[PDB]
Amino acid sequence: ATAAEIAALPRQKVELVDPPFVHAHSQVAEGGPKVVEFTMVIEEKKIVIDDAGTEVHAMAFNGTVPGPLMVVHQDDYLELTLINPETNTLMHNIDFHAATGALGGGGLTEINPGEKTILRFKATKPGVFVYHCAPPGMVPWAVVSGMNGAIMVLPREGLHDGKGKALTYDKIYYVGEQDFYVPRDENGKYKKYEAPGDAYEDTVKVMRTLTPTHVVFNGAVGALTGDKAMTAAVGEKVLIVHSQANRDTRPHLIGGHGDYVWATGKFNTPPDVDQETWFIPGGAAGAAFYTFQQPGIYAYVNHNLIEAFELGAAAHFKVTGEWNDDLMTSVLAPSG
Amino acid sequence: ATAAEIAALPRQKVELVDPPFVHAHSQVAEGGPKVVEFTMVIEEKKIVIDDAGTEVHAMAFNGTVPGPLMVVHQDDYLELTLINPETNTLMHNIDFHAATGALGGGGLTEINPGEKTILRFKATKPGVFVYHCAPPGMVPWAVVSGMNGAIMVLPREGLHDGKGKALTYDKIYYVGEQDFYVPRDENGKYKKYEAPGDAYEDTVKVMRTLTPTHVVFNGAVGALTGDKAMTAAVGEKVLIVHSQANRDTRPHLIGGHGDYVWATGKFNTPPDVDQETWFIPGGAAGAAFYTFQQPGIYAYVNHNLIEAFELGAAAHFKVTGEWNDDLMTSVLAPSG
Amino acid sequence: ATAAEIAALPRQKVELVDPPFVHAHSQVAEGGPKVVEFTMVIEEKKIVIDDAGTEVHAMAFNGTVPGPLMVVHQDDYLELTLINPETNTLMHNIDFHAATGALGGGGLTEINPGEKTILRFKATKPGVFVYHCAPPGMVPWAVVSGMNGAIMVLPREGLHDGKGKALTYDKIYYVGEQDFYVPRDENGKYKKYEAPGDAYEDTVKVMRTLTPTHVVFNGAVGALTGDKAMTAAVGEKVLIVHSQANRDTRPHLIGGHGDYVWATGKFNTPPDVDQETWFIPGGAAGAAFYTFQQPGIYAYVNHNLIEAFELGAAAHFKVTGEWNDDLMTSVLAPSGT
Ligand SMILES: [Cu+2]
Ligand SMILES: [Cu+2]
Ligand SMILES: [Cu+2]
Ligand SMILES: [Cu+]
Ligand SMILES: [Cu+]
């Protein structure tokens, strides 16, 4: 493309929405390539991540853990204005795994408190991709303090199965999974710290054990359960995007399946089918497509069940509709 | 199918056999869909898992760790009579990853001691699938106490490679891999308990380290060696089903390969080929197909070699037949 | 083939080179099957694995960690002369995951100090494959002491993508990733040992935690950085072979991708495409193919970033050439709000 051609492309501002929700978009690209414009403000803030009042000094894109899902189409440009308010204490940047060059954008986006930057990259590859902060000399600490999210680069013609049949979802959720490493005193009580930097040395010690104290969805134990369960109806087609910026995970829909799973997250690699449990390596995003067939409460988990039910990696779906006795039936209910 | 149509289908009662053996079945489906009937009694028993006399309070489907492999074909119905004897102390249930609805059957099969239940589900998706117990509030504890197995849902026309060529095995073995988390006293000696519930609190602390004390096949270190080594001959086609309900594994046949590997365990997902070491995520089953070409002793391991040779994850195959010097020869035997 | 037909085949003696470099070879096979001959001497040697001077008594094929990459084509015979010099103290052997029978060759290559052996096998399956020592009773200790490498069995017609299109690399690197388990004292400082045997019991304890103290490329923290960084140019096609004989890894090129990735390492299994981060399970090798599009520094890491940046699993590429502002541009450089 010529300089004038790039310059002439339409520019569109998109307002972001907090996870697990996803901003309005079209599955099939509406017209030619665009420069899609997003803005995110970085917030350093204390968050509580469990029922014991455990604190983390979060580093949060757009104020959330994970950061929001940005959606564009292949060969669009993504143009991010990233803002680091003067009230923050650390330099921050952004690495888009979807982008090509300068450490994914990290080398071009180092902003001190009181600074902003604008990065544009061409989204040449279709898929879901991780993004994360990566300040040289403290990369893992930034990432495991929650400074990560994902984007989706849809094929211009939307999603398809391995045989080129269209796969069109009715809704989409983004589940960001976070490993946290919270220091404890010798009595086993989680420690609290006045300033983010104060926790650095104690936290790295925990990190080096490679054993998270908490593994959570949407930034806290139980964030996506109970009255915050995700929703669907029988017959509804749902895409579940799942990311993990630092550590492996194995998602599983209890009572369901991944009908089509782009386990690697890349849409030019044909999806696996009929999956019980899929695998997303640390530093990647994946996506599963499922049509609900049964009503009721589902759990959606990391299928290391210790991580799911002891460490926090469990969400719910509440699904409306009619029960299908062909698929499953209690022939004899639990009885003496 | 309507209730009436289901009621009219032929019934077939199957008698289960202890792992690693697999009950009598046909690879190609005999006739139209049927209701395949299985019965399992839950046994809570002490198992010894290593040569140091270390004990686990097992929770065992059909009295074994893993539970037995159930084999059906796609679009058959699997009808399980699950029995929880008065000699047990805990509520138990079953989640079939192969099933659709009610948390894989777990919501509909909660049986107190002295109770039984019958669940029927349509096996709509072909592949190997995990099944496991999942009592709300105690899910990981049930699973890592050995309450898990697998089923195989064969395609009605049997197995095929990625290009439609038939793959027919002569032998089939089922390896269930188990991560155990056994508490230790202050001298590093493993603890013994006189009732299952007594170990709970201590065990949860070990589980939270995400570091198993033992990783075993068929419920114990060395279980599938010696009297229980798997057997074959040169020229024989062998299918090895492998499950792990809670934790990742990486199977490898030492001296062999996985000629065809359904690493995700799902038969509509084309198999990988010529594998050295495959990968099965926690909460899943996989299957490898191999034609033996050399006689001798083989080891079959989780290829984290610490897990294989320090923690217990190693089995043997004993293979009869003629040595093939074209494939491999000692040109100069070890010498000065 | 018969003994006689194999005897008639041409021989090719190859000189191995140290990782991350790879000995001269042809992507598309030159002529018919050959017996390709390699020699490696095993060295039990003290090595330094980080900038602090932490020592490990390594067990090293050809004196390097990892051992060197051997390259043959499908249905060639690989013929290895393996030597265990009298200066060593342990029995050693070799298991080629590429080979069929006798525990990958381990059953036939058990050599005490002062012994040698010659093993030949037919490389029947195309792909990259781990090889490693495996003395019964001491298997994981040998492997996590650095005694492992990889081989590449190219298809006779070179590489192709999943749809038959030829993929020809301009250069190839071999990154061997090593998990080390180094005992610490009550200060938390790494211990040093006079003899390899002295370290055994303390090391097995660390191994049991399943938590390495170091996770490194080419035998040490920072080994593939500075004047030892890998290099490329804009437009250059690079194959990166990556192995891990004992523990999972998740490779990622920061600023790039794996355009085609044989994540399982086996060339008859079609590659994944457009990968951000791929996965290679412990006991396997994988390979990624990438065409560089942008100049500058890249890091190549295990994307458990704690492993990458705290434990040592990070390498650098330095890439020359002209920057592409279409692909990426700083619309507004960091500046005051
Ligand atoms: Cu990254
Ligand atoms: Cu499950
Ligand atoms: Cu091996
Ligand atoms: Cu940051
Ligand atoms: Cu149970």
Ligand SMILES: [Cu+]
């Ligand atoms: Cu050795």
